[PDB]
Amino acid sequence: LTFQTSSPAHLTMPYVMPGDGEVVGVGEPVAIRFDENIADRGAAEKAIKITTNPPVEGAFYWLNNREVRWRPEHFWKPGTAVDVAVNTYGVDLGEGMFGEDNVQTHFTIGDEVIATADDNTKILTVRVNGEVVKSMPTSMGKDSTPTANGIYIVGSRYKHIIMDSSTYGVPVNSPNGYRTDVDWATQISYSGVFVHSAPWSVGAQGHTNTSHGCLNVSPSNAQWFYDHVKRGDIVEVVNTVGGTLPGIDGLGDWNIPWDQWRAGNAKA
Ligand SMILES: *C(=O)[C@@H]([C@@H]1N=C(C(=O)O)[C@@H](S[C@@H]2CN[C@H](C(=O)N(C)C)C2)[C@@H]1C)[C@@H](C)O
């Protein structure tokens, strides 16, 4: 090791996901998020070495100035081992910022889990390695607030969570201020789309869209989803009146056409 001089005002640390040793779904990108905006994005990329077994072609794309993603063209093949070496220690990241340390993570791809929410049938169907394991009636976004179509990556899971409209800057005791307690919530977009328990819409699930954009399912189906779906599994939404989920949402990565993703967007 070669020592690098440093100052707490001129250092930035990388954080890698997913965690070391984790088993993730086929949609999980590698994510490296820095604790500061990066000016030399080309230098960061060059510092990161991703190796796969079986080997598959992949590429980097920046979600924003803090976070870079790497994925293949198509969903991961189950069983794949992925090694990530972020060799940023002492790397000049531009504007006098330097990499603070190296981080190394290793993870594996589990079963192919793909759930399709079809707005034509109002059924959410979960396939594991091509086989249907579960059908759930669902209620998605009403016409004024539709659920976007596209490919969503499963993120965090919560036994209980608060949906508070003021974090979207729209207060309660307001036009639409809500503060709502929700059980068994699985996050599928950074914009705040969740699959979750909705006892208040059980009669509509399978028939009519009534939500603000979330996938409302029954309490027991929502608990099922929470138990059986992991980070990196895929939810595909089709046939809604909405547009397409933004590719830079945070969990929207697969919505970016491969030619654009591969070309990348790194200021070098
Ligand atoms: C889920 O139902 C939650 C709501 N779902 C949303 C979504 O589908 O993205 C948003 S509301 C929607 C997104 N953009 C519009 C807006 O005015 N902004 C918030 C910027 C409307 C919301 C988190 C919630 C009800 O649990």
Side-chain angles (χ1 to χ4, degrees):
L1 185 90
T2 294
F3 174 78
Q4 168 81 27
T5 192
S6 70
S7 152
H10 298 268
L11 284 166
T12 175
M13 180 76 84
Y15 292 94
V16 185
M17 307 233 69
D20 204 26
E22 299 193 342
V23 183
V24 296
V26 297
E28 187 82 343
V30 175
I32 299 93
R33 176 170 180 91
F34 296 84
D35 59 9
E36 299 278 60
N37 293 307
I38 296 312
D40 196 337
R41 262 110 61 210
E45 279 183 29
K46 259 29 137 262
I48 301 158
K49 168 90 182 161
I50 287 143
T51 48
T52 53
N53 185 198
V56 67
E57 172 186 10
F60 292 106
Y61 194 90
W62 292 79
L63 297 193
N64 53 54
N65 296 159
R66 321 245 324 252
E67 179 159 3
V68 71
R69 299 284 176 88
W70 191 104
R71 61 174 178 81
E73 174 174 14
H74 291 112
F75 294 150
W76 291 102
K77 171 154 182 282
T80 301
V82 183
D83 293 287
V84 186
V86 186
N87 303 312
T88 42
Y89 180 78
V91 171
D92 183 354
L93 297 170
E95 292 168 9
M97 226 68 196
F98 292 81
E100 186 150 0
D101 202 356
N102 300 314
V103 281
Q104 323 271 301
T105 196
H106 171 82
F107 69 92
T108 63
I109 306 302
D111 296 315
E112 190 198 43
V113 185
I114 302 169
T116 310
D118 189 348
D119 202 46
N120 283 351
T121 58
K122 310 271 203 257
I123 299 302
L124 181 58
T125 304
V126 190
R127 293 169 179 85
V128 174
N129 295 139
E131 156 171 9
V132 175
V133 299
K134 191 83 188 196
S135 296
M136 313 181 179
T138 190
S139 182
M140 298 196 285
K142 63 210 192 304
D143 278 14
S144 61
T145 55
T147 306
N149 302 293
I151 300 162
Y152 293 71
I153 302 161
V154 170
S156 283
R157 275 180 298 120
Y158 296 94
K159 290 184 176 162
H160 200 253
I161 187 157
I162 298 161
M163 310 297 207
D164 191 320
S165 69
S166 63
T167 67
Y168 296 85
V170 76
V172 206
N173 280 60
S174 214
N176 321 74
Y178 49 74
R179 185 176 179 83
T180 316
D181 291 81
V182 169
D183 294 334
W184 308 116
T186 300
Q187 189 175 35
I188 64 166
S189 88
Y190 280 21
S191 62
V193 182
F194 286 80
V195 175
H196 70 81
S197 172
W200 50 91
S201 72
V202 293
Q205 288 153 23
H207 307 108
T208 293
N209 285 338
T210 63
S211 76
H212 289 53
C214 290
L215 286 58
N216 287 7
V217 299
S218 76
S220 78
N221 277 145
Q223 182 180 359
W224 190 92
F225 201 89
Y226 176 98
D227 287 335
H228 292 82
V229 179
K230 60 195 131 59
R231 181 176 300 277
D233 293 344
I234 295 292
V235 175
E236 184 164 20
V237 174
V238 299
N239 298 136
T240 83
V241 309
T244 303
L245 184 73
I248 63 165
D249 162 276
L251 295 164
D253 306 36
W254 300 97
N255 306 292
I256 297 177
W258 181 241
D259 66 344
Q260 295 175 212
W261 186 282
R262 192 191 49 208
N265 56 358
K267 173 169 86 164

Coordinates of all heavy atoms in Angstrom, one line a residue, residues 34-73:
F34 N -21.3 7.8 -3.8 CA -20.3 8.6 -3.1 C -21.0 9.6 -2.2 O -22.1 9.9 -2.4 CB -19.4 9.3 -4.1 CG -18.6 8.4 -5.0 CD1 -19.2 7.8 -6.2 CD2 -17.3 8.0 -4.7 CE1 -18.4 7.0 -7.0 CE2 -16.6 7.1 -5.5 CZ -17.2 6.6 -6.6
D35 N -20.3 10.0 -1.1 CA -20.9 10.9 -0.2 C -20.8 12.3 -0.6 O -21.2 13.2 0.1 CB -20.5 10.6 1.3 CG -19.0 10.7 1.4 OD1 -18.3 11.2 0.5 OD2 -18.5 10.3 2.5
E36 N -20.2 12.6 -1.8 CA -20.2 13.9 -2.4 C -20.4 13.8 -3.9 O -20.2 12.7 -4.5 CB -18.8 14.5 -2.2 CG -18.4 14.8 -0.8 CD -18.9 16.1 -0.2 OE1 -20.2 16.2 -0.1 OE2 -18.1 16.9 0.2
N37 N -20.9 14.9 -4.5 CA -21.0 15.0 -6.0 C -19.6 14.8 -6.5 O -18.6 15.4 -6.0 CB -21.6 16.3 -6.4 CG -23.1 16.4 -6.1 OD1 -23.9 15.5 -6.4 ND2 -23.5 17.5 -5.4
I38 N -19.5 14.0 -7.6 CA -18.2 13.7 -8.2 C -18.0 14.6 -9.5 O -19.0 14.6 -10.3 CB -18.2 12.2 -8.6 CG1 -18.3 11.3 -7.4 CG2 -17.0 11.8 -9.5 CD1 -17.3 11.6 -6.3
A39 N -16.9 15.3 -9.6 CA -16.7 16.0 -10.9 C -16.1 15.2 -12.0 O -16.5 15.3 -13.1 CB -15.9 17.3 -10.6
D40 N -15.1 14.4 -11.6 CA -14.5 13.5 -12.7 C -15.1 12.1 -12.7 O -14.6 11.2 -12.0 CB -13.0 13.5 -12.5 CG -12.3 12.9 -13.8 OD1 -12.9 12.2 -14.6 OD2 -11.1 13.2 -14.0
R41 N -16.2 12.0 -13.3 CA -17.0 10.8 -13.3 C -16.2 9.7 -14.1 O -16.3 8.5 -13.8 CB -18.4 11.0 -13.8 CG -19.4 11.1 -12.7 CD -20.0 12.5 -12.5 NE -20.8 13.0 -13.6 CZ -20.9 14.3 -13.8 NH1 -20.3 15.2 -13.0 NH2 -21.6 14.8 -14.9
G42 N -15.5 10.0 -15.2 CA -14.7 9.1 -15.9 C -13.6 8.5 -15.0 O -13.4 7.3 -15.1
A43 N -13.0 9.3 -14.2 CA -12.0 8.8 -13.2 C -12.6 7.8 -12.2 O -11.9 6.7 -11.9 CB -11.3 9.9 -12.5
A44 N -13.8 8.0 -11.8 CA -14.4 7.1 -10.9 C -14.7 5.8 -11.5 O -14.5 4.7 -10.9 CB -15.7 7.7 -10.3
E45 N -15.1 5.8 -12.8 CA -15.5 4.6 -13.5 C -14.2 3.7 -13.7 O -14.2 2.5 -13.5 CB -16.1 4.9 -14.9 CG -17.5 5.3 -14.8 CD -18.1 5.5 -16.2 OE1 -17.6 5.0 -17.2 OE2 -19.0 6.3 -16.3
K46 N -13.2 4.4 -14.1 CA -11.9 3.8 -14.3 C -11.4 3.1 -13.1 O -10.7 2.2 -13.1 CB -10.9 4.8 -14.9 CG -10.7 4.7 -16.4 CD -11.9 4.3 -17.1 CE -12.3 5.1 -18.4 NZ -13.3 6.1 -18.2
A47 N -11.7 3.6 -11.9 CA -11.4 3.1 -10.6 C -12.1 1.9 -10.2 O -11.7 1.3 -9.2 CB -11.4 4.2 -9.6
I48 N -13.2 1.5 -10.8 CA -14.1 0.5 -10.4 C -14.0 -0.7 -11.3 O -14.1 -0.6 -12.5 CB -15.5 1.0 -10.4 CG1 -15.6 2.1 -9.4 CG2 -16.5 -0.2 -10.0 CD1 -16.8 3.0 -9.6
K49 N -13.8 -1.9 -10.7 CA -13.5 -3.1 -11.5 C -14.6 -4.1 -11.2 O -14.7 -4.4 -10.0 CB -12.1 -3.6 -11.1 CG -11.8 -5.0 -11.7 CD -11.2 -4.9 -13.0 CE -10.9 -6.3 -13.6 NZ -10.7 -6.3 -15.1
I50 N -15.4 -4.5 -12.1 CA -16.5 -5.4 -11.9 C -16.2 -6.7 -12.7 O -15.9 -6.6 -13.9 CB -17.9 -4.8 -12.1 CG1 -18.2 -3.9 -11.0 CG2 -19.0 -5.9 -12.2 CD1 -19.0 -2.6 -11.4
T51 N -16.2 -7.8 -12.0 CA -15.9 -9.1 -12.6 C -17.1 -10.0 -12.3 O -17.7 -10.0 -11.2 CB -14.6 -9.8 -12.2 OG1 -14.6 -9.7 -10.7 CG2 -13.4 -9.0 -12.7
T52 N -17.5 -10.9 -13.3 CA -18.7 -11.7 -13.2 C -18.3 -13.2 -13.5 O -17.4 -13.4 -14.4 CB -19.8 -11.2 -14.0 OG1 -19.4 -11.0 -15.4 CG2 -20.3 -9.8 -13.5
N53 N -19.0 -14.1 -13.0 CA -18.8 -15.5 -13.3 C -20.1 -16.2 -13.2 O -20.7 -16.3 -12.1 CB -17.8 -16.1 -12.3 CG -17.4 -17.6 -12.6 OD1 -16.9 -18.3 -11.8 ND2 -17.7 -18.0 -13.9
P54 N -20.7 -16.7 -14.3 CA -20.2 -16.7 -15.7 C -20.1 -15.2 -16.2 O -20.9 -14.4 -15.7 CB -21.3 -17.4 -16.5 CG -21.9 -18.3 -15.5 CD -21.9 -17.5 -14.2
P55 N -19.1 -14.9 -17.0 CA -18.8 -13.5 -17.4 C -19.9 -13.0 -18.3 O -20.3 -13.7 -19.3 CB -17.4 -13.6 -18.1 CG -17.2 -15.0 -18.5 CD -18.1 -15.9 -17.6
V56 N -20.3 -11.7 -18.1 CA -21.3 -11.1 -18.9 C -20.9 -9.7 -19.2 O -20.3 -9.1 -18.3 CB -22.7 -11.3 -18.3 CG1 -22.8 -10.4 -17.0 CG2 -23.8 -10.8 -19.2
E57 N -21.1 -9.2 -20.4 CA -20.8 -7.8 -20.7 C -21.7 -6.8 -19.9 O -22.9 -7.1 -19.7 CB -21.1 -7.6 -22.2 CG -21.0 -6.1 -22.7 CD -21.4 -6.0 -24.2 OE1 -22.0 -7.0 -24.8 OE2 -21.2 -4.9 -24.8
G58 N -21.1 -5.8 -19.3 CA -21.9 -4.8 -18.6 C -21.4 -3.4 -18.9 O -20.3 -3.2 -19.5
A59 N -22.0 -2.4 -18.3 CA -21.6 -1.0 -18.5 C -22.1 -0.1 -17.4 O -23.1 -0.4 -16.8 CB -22.1 -0.5 -19.9
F60 N -21.4 1.0 -17.2 CA -21.7 2.0 -16.2 C -22.6 3.1 -16.8 O -22.4 3.5 -17.9 CB -20.4 2.8 -15.7 CG -19.5 1.9 -14.9 CD1 -18.3 1.5 -15.5 CD2 -19.7 1.5 -13.6 CE1 -17.4 0.7 -14.8 CE2 -18.8 0.8 -12.9 CZ -17.7 0.3 -13.5
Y61 N -23.5 3.5 -15.9 CA -24.3 4.7 -16.2 C -24.6 5.4 -14.9 O -24.9 4.8 -13.9 CB -25.7 4.2 -16.9 CG -26.4 5.4 -17.6 CD1 -26.2 5.7 -18.9 CD2 -27.4 6.1 -16.9 CE1 -26.9 6.7 -19.5 CE2 -28.2 7.1 -17.5 CZ -27.9 7.4 -18.8 OH -28.6 8.4 -19.4
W62 N -24.5 6.8 -15.0 CA -24.7 7.6 -13.8 C -26.1 8.0 -13.6 O -26.7 8.6 -14.5 CB -23.8 8.8 -13.8 CG -22.4 8.5 -13.7 CD1 -21.5 7.9 -14.6 CD2 -21.6 8.6 -12.5 NE1 -20.3 7.7 -14.1 CE2 -20.2 8.1 -12.8 CE3 -21.8 9.0 -11.2 CZ2 -19.2 8.0 -11.9 CZ3 -20.7 9.0 -10.2 CH2 -19.5 8.5 -10.6
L63 N -26.7 7.7 -12.5 CA -28.1 8.2 -12.1 C -28.1 9.7 -11.8 O -29.0 10.3 -12.1 CB -28.7 7.4 -11.0 CG -28.9 5.9 -11.3 CD1 -29.8 5.4 -10.2 CD2 -29.5 5.7 -12.7
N64 N -27.0 10.1 -11.2 CA -26.9 11.6 -10.9 C -25.4 11.7 -10.6 O -24.6 10.8 -10.8 CB -27.8 11.9 -9.7 CG -27.5 11.0 -8.5 OD1 -26.4 10.8 -8.0 ND2 -28.6 10.4 -8.0
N65 N -25.0 12.9 -10.1 CA -23.6 13.1 -9.9 C -23.0 12.4 -8.7 O -21.9 12.4 -8.6 CB -23.3 14.6 -9.8 CG -23.6 15.4 -11.0 OD1 -23.8 16.5 -11.0 ND2 -23.7 14.7 -12.1
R66 N -23.8 11.8 -7.9 CA -23.3 11.0 -6.7 C -23.3 9.5 -6.9 O -22.6 8.8 -6.2 CB -24.2 11.3 -5.5 CG -24.7 12.7 -5.2 CD -24.1 13.3 -4.0 NE -23.9 12.2 -3.0 CZ -24.6 12.2 -1.9 NH1 -25.5 13.1 -1.6 NH2 -24.5 11.2 -1.0
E67 N -24.0 9.0 -7.8 CA -24.3 7.6 -7.9 C -24.2 7.0 -9.3 O -24.8 7.4 -10.2 CB -25.6 7.2 -7.3 CG -26.0 5.7 -7.4 CD -27.0 5.3 -6.3 OE1 -27.5 6.1 -5.6 OE2 -27.3 4.1 -6.3
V68 N -23.3 5.9 -9.4 CA -23.1 5.2 -10.7 C -23.7 3.8 -10.6 O -23.6 3.2 -9.5 CB -21.7 5.3 -11.2 CG1 -20.7 4.5 -10.3 CG2 -21.6 4.9 -12.7
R69 N -24.2 3.3 -11.7 CA -24.8 1.9 -11.7 C -24.1 1.1 -12.8 O -23.6 1.7 -13.8 CB -26.3 2.0 -12.0 CG -27.1 2.7 -11.0 CD -27.3 1.9 -9.7 NE -28.0 2.6 -8.6 CZ -29.3 2.6 -8.5 NH1 -30.1 1.9 -9.4 NH2 -29.9 3.2 -7.5
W70 N -24.0 -0.2 -12.6 CA -23.5 -1.1 -13.6 C -24.4 -2.3 -13.7 O -24.8 -2.9 -12.8 CB -22.1 -1.5 -13.2 CG -21.3 -2.3 -14.2 CD1 -20.2 -1.8 -15.0 CD2 -21.3 -3.7 -14.5 NE1 -19.7 -2.8 -15.8 CE2 -20.3 -4.0 -15.5 CE3 -22.2 -4.8 -14.1 CZ2 -20.1 -5.3 -16.1 CZ3 -22.0 -6.1 -14.7 CH2 -21.0 -6.3 -15.6
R71 N -24.8 -2.6 -15.0 CA -25.6 -3.8 -15.2 C -25.3 -4.4 -16.6 O -24.7 -3.7 -17.5 CB -27.1 -3.5 -15.1 CG -27.6 -2.4 -16.1 CD -29.1 -2.3 -16.1 NE -29.7 -1.3 -17.0 CZ -29.9 -1.4 -18.3 NH1 -29.6 -2.6 -18.9 NH2 -30.5 -0.5 -18.9
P72 N -25.7 -5.7 -16.8 CA -25.7 -6.2 -18.1 C -26.8 -5.7 -19.0 O -27.7 -5.0 -18.5 CB -25.8 -7.7 -18.0 CG -25.9 -8.0 -16.5 CD -26.1 -6.7 -15.8
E73 N -26.9 -6.1 -20.2 CA -27.9 -5.7 -21.2 C -29.3 -6.3 -20.8 O -30.3 -5.7 -20.9 CB -27.5 -6.2 -22.6 CG -28.6 -5.9 -23.6 CD -28.2 -6.2 -25.1 OE1 -27.2 -6.8 -25.3 OE2 -29.0 -5.8 -25.9

